Design a binder for this molecule. Structure first.
Ligand SMILES: CCCCCCCCCCCCCCCCCC(=O)O[C@H](COC(=O)CCCCCCCCCCCCCCC)COP(=O)(O)OCC[N+](C)(C)C
Ligand SMILES: CCCCCCCCCCCCCCCCCC(=O)O[C@H](COC(=O)CCCCCCCCCCCCCCC)COP(=O)(O)OCC[N+](C)(C)C
Ligand SMILES: Cc1cccc(O)c1O
Ligand SMILES: Cc1cccc(O)c1O
Ligand SMILES: [Fe+3]
Ligand SMILES: [Fe+3]
Lengths: 256, 256
């Protein structure tokens, strides 16, 4: 993991970042025992392997809001800590891999097209999709799930179209028996994310987009702990006589 | 380590602390690769056991500046990460324990009196003193030093007086082959603290004071990496015909 930040730019950032915290401490009269609690918790965050968790929930949304300033395509959202590269490729119309359990849940049928800024369809286009199962678990972040449960790389057809069938995701609770959940518990917050799909959408010559989609009227949609929900990314699926939820969303990519 | 911070107070703090960082990220256009570097470094800080180091150098000075608002006695300073409780008690006039190496260094003779706000001397008074040796090492933070090298608990006499002989401390470099020094290296900073003594001064019925003392004209005194030097805490020892450095400083305690 590298950047090419200059010492001068790190110096300006660190100074107002340290200035920032130091000013909060001064504003609220943080005490020595509060300080000691804060020191222990930071240690616990690392010992709990929760730096990705904590930072993706509480910080990454500002880093996406930066990127969002230079992009004219589909709204992005945070990646979160559960992306895995190289999920198995599937054809343009496919079902995501799932367990027999998973089949008991309302299907979600997700259609659309990857296009450029003018609205031309894109051949070569990929949709990387991943989301939690109805129990709030992600494959590879839970020993009982097949390694690619509800994960996959959809190859859009020559026109950049896809029809991907999955399960309707459910509200997901972040892990809470660790320093991150203890942090939310101690301030009477809640550890919930709205139900959501995660997606990385790509095409030759295009800048990839990392995004999420949520579901209209879904719970926690206006109080996501990760502060990652945007109005533009809320789908409103219609249910068909077959009892499957159906939705169309297209992705629009900026030039790389 | 506990506090009795209310959820509401944690909520107000965390909100402007997160607001703070999130605003820095927005101000400087922090990028995804910068974000990834920052995530790794945080992990490395924990894996390097450097949370006490990092926070005592870059944050604790604001927490002392809070405490400083309610105290009328001697100026405090940060504790730093190297305090050890229960250092062996010594009499009111004593030498701090040291190695044969240590004896090659100019002695420092440190005199004074612990008093209250009105200037009455204090019986029962203790000075806990600790500092680095001429090599920049602290006992118990370096496998080659005796466990109480340059550490001790001086019992002030019935009038609250002490005459403590030690070595003249030297500028201390913080550890730099870790994530904290890498953080300072990457911004073209320097990892130096001015030469200094650490002290906890106590008396029955008094609120203890944690402080540090520095040496007039000493290097890094105006650019301490820990931002912990105060003008009030700079001593100006005089050297005697015996070639020992001599200095008088008294401590004034607030009521507990
Ligand atoms: C760069 C990433 C870091 C960004 C900083 C984000 C803000 C962090 C502030 C949250 C500190 C986490 C403290 C919550 C843990 C408390 C639960 C706990 O186990 O302690 C308990 C008791 O502690 C409590 O219940 C009260 C917790 C709140 C006191 C901590 C307030 C810390 C504020 C100082 C941070 C200011 C930073 C600027 C120990 O008993 P067991
Ligand atoms: C609550 C405590 C935390 C408070 C936050 C304080 C500010 C933290 C910002 C400093 C991040 C530390 C990055 C320095 C490590 C870089 C050296 C390194 O190994 O990376 C190198 C390359 O990285 C570099 O050389 C450039 C480093 C600067 C880029 C990081 C900037 C981070 C800014 C984001 C933080 C904003 C927070 C608000 C990997 O090659 P090996
Ligand atoms: C942003 C985010 C944070 C934690 C867990 C998740 O599933 C997620 O999407
Ligand atoms: C404040 C501080 C931080 C790091 C090392 C020290 O010796 C010290 O006094
Ligand atoms: Fe998620
Ligand atoms: Fe020190």
């Amino acid at each position: 993991a590298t950047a090419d930040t200059s010492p001068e730019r790190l110096a300006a950032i660190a100074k107002d970042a340290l200035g920032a915290l130091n000013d909060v401490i001064l504003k609220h009269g943080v005490t020595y025992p509060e300080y000691r609690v804060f020191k222990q918790w930071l240690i616990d965050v690392g010992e709990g392997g929760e730096w990705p968790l904590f930072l993706d929930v509480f910080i990454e949304h500002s880093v996406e809001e930066v990127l969002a300033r230079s992009r004219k395509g589909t709204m992005g959202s945070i990646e979160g800590p559960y992306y895995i590269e190289n999920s198995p490729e599937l054809p343009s119309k496919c079902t995501l891999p799932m367990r027999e359990e998973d089949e008991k849940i309302t299907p979600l049928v997700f259609s659309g097209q990857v296009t450029d800024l003018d609205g031309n369809g894109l051949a070569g286009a990929k949709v990387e999709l991943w989301h939690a199962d109805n129990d709030g678990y992600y494959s590879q972040f839970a020993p009982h799930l097949p390694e690619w449960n509800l994960r996959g790389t959809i190859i859009a057809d020559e026109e950049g179209r896809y029809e991907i069938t999955t399960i309707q995701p459910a509200p997901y609770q972040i892990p809470t028996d660790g320093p991150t959940g203890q942090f939310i518990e101690a301030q009477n917050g809640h550890p919930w994310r709205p139900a959501h799909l995660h997606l990385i959408v790509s095409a030759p010559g295009k800048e990839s987009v990392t995004t999420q989609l949520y579901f209209k009227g879904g719970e926690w949609i206006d109080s996501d702990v990760a502060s990652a929900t945007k109005p533009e990314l809320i789908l409103d699926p219609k249910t068909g006589d077959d009892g499957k939820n159906y939705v169309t969303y297209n992705f629009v990519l900026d030039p790389a």
